[model samples]
Target: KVFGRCELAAAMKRHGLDNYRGYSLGNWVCAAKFESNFNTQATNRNTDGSTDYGILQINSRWWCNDGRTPGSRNLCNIPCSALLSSDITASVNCAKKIVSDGNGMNAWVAWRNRCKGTDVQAWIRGCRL
Candidate 1:
């Protein structure tokens, strides 16, 4: 079965963040929510004042400069816009790549754990994702 926004949010909270070790889930969600309303199809002008594109708000120029362009092997190849095309799975997968690359998801998990009054880090460590 496909995951919806809420499910995606939960999975992201559980897997994206490093159990609230680095960044909080709430902050991550806030960025995702405020930037795209939790909609994977969301795009906006980066607050850093750049023309970066895609869901999770990837910065193409930065990516290109780093020679980590998404369309090449040894890195994600999907176009930045593909992330904002309303395909939740794609967007989430893209996010997973970013997180797995050491971008930090602690803030997102922290946010979720805060609301539940639980140790976000502990919860994340316990998660089998």
Candidate 2:
């Protein structure tokens, strides 16, 4: 039940993590489990009434551009279409970056501690890459 080829390839391309191996997938699954429960169609509300979309939950205003007008209520200022093109990978890569950004693995460690509590070490040990 791992990610399919198109999904995995798209993920690698979007996140610029083309060289990732199976071990990376393990880490990704951990992050996604906490981030949005692996829900690709997930979305959340912003204070300004805008929204974050997909599994990464990227703010639509920050990424999607299609229904928006020029100079209109855009805080993120990025296009949504571009974001949609690589949605899955973008989310996964973002999570990977957050973990690799030197939180001492504690961020994930904490996630495991709090979320998976009793199974923390075993979970990480099971992570292949």
lDDT (tens digit, per residue) of candidate 2 on 1-129: 234334543454456543343233334444444545555655566676666555545545434444643433433444544434434544554445544545523444424554443432333343223
- Candidate 1 lands at a TM-score of 0.46
RMSD of each: 7.6, 7.0
Q: TM-scores across all candidates? A: 0.46, 0.42
What lDDT does each candidate get? Answer: 0.47, 0.46
Q: In model 1, where is the ten-residue run with the lowest total lDDT?
A: 63-72
Candidate 2: where is the Cα deviation over 4 Å?
1-31, 66-87, 90-129
Instruction: Summarize candidate 1's per-residue lDDT along 34-61 as a digit string, tens digits.
Output: 3445565544554444433443555544
Model 2 global lDDT (CA atoms, 0 to 1): 0.46
* Residue 97 in candidate 2, Cα distance off native in Å: 9.9
Off by over 4 Å in 1: 1-31, 46-55, 62-74, 106-129
